[PDB]
Amino acid sequence: GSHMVGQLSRGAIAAIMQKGDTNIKPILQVINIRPITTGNSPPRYRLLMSDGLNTLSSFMLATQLNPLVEEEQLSSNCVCQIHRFIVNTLKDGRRVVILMELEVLKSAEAVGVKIGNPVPYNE
Numbered sequence: 685g686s687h688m689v690g691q692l693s694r695g696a697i698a699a700i701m702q703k704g705d706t707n708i709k710p711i712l713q714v715i716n717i718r719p720i721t722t723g724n725s726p727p728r729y730r731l732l733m734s735d736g737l738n739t740l741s742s743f744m745l746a747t748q749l750n751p752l753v754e755e756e757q758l759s760s761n762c763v764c765q766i767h768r769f770i771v772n773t774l775k776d777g778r779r780v781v782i783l784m785e786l787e788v789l790k791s792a793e794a795v796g797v798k799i800g801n802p803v804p805y806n807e
């Protein structure tokens with residue numbers, strides 16, 4: 685699959701954070717996933733995602749999507765299409781992007797590397 689960066693929705697991260705563009709269904713790569721410290725509740729997963737241009741670590745999976753991480757694909761390097769998300773703003777001004785529906789387009793094993801050379805998005 686030549687031109688790998690062409691597989692990702694370059695600019696979607698900026699669109700999500702500067703426009704609050706929500707009527708997009710961007711294709712992103714998972715760079716990393718880690719659990720967040722939660723007390724008793726179901727675990728919550730934070731994701732570092734890439735659009736080919738930028739990475740952003742403010743993504744959180746909706747708890748209903750937990751089985752994707754625990755049982756199925758969802759792991760570093762996979763390529764996913766985000767079908768539903770919402771942005772939430774914390775009292776301190778930071779924004780978190782909650783992933784509500786997503787589809788794994790390519791498994792981690794089928795991609796195998798971080799696509800392109802994305803740099804961290806600022807703010």
Ligand SMILES: O=C(O)c1ccc(-c2ccc(F)c(Cl)c2)o1
Nearest residue numbers: 719720721730741742778779780
């Ligand atoms: O253990 C962690 O990784 C963790 C705990 C809490 C947060 C967090 C809180 C507010 C935010 F906006 C973002 Cl991006 C992250 O990350």
Ligand SMILES: O=C(O)c1ccc(-c2ccc(F)c(Cl)c2)o1
Nearest residue numbers: 728744745746747748772780782
């Ligand atoms: O369905 C869910 O699991 C859900 C809906 C909204 C949130 C949420 C809202 C603010 C946050 F900071 C974090 Cl981490 C999550 O999680």
